[PDB]
Design a protein around this ligand. Structure first.
Ligand SMILES: O=C(Nc1ccc2ncccc2c1)c1ccccc1
Length: 185
């Protein structure tokens, strides 16, 4: 890819975070806390899962950002509609307003319905996410492997403004405490 020059400075939106998450002062890192984080409930917060949105909203143009996933066992990354469900249980699918990939139990999968197996030779430490709003495209790149393509969603029905989407995952195992980090441009 040659997508870096549509680089956008993403920050995390505290108000959207599940109440167990800890967002750094610079709003560029998020991790799972060991307890509910002494914040009020609000209608924006994801209730059931360790999810948070970026502050930025996109309705046009090309956008690119990078996320560090070093030492994590489980995570979801991508973009979602501003209008996605926040409360209760749901699946990650384009029908529900999500364009995502994830790591789960040593397999990488794209959040189609049903999910799609990914073929990655070099487990990634940093992921690039590219959105072309007008083209209807969301693409994922393996920064650890010279920017190699991971997956492309095409003909996307964004149906409204988009937000960067993050899930740090649970830490039942004790092996998934590490943060997601937005990488410098
Ligand atoms: O399994 C389901 N959703 C999720 C979503 C996010 C998760 N994040 C961390 C851990 C588990 C998660 C599970 C689901 C929900 C409804 C109907 C069918 C399936």
């Amino acid at each position: 890819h040659h997508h870096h020059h549509h680089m956008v400075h993403i920050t995390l939106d505290r108000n959207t975070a599940n109440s167990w998450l800890i967002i750094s002062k610079d709003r560029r890192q998020v991790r799972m806390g060991d307890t509910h984080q002494n914040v009020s409930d609000n209608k924006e917060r994801f209730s059931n899962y360790p999810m948070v949105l970026g502050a930025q909203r996109f309705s046009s143009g090309k956008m690119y950002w990078e996320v560090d996933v070093t030492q994590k066992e489980a995570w979801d990354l991508g973009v979602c509609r501003d209008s996605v469900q926040r409360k209760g249980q749901f699946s990650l699918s384009p029908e529900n307003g999500f364009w995502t990939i994830w790591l789960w139990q040593d397999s990488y999968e794209a959040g189609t319905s049903p999910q799609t197996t990914l073929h990655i030779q070099v487990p990634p430490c940093q992921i690039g996410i590219f959105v072309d709003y007008e083209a209807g495209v969301v693409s994922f790149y393996n920064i650890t492997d010279h920017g190699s393509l991971i997956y492309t969603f095409s003909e996307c029905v964004f149906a409204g403004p988009l937000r960067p989407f993050f899930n740090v995952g649970f830490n039942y195992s004790g092996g998934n405490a590490a943060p997601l980090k937005l990488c410098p441009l």
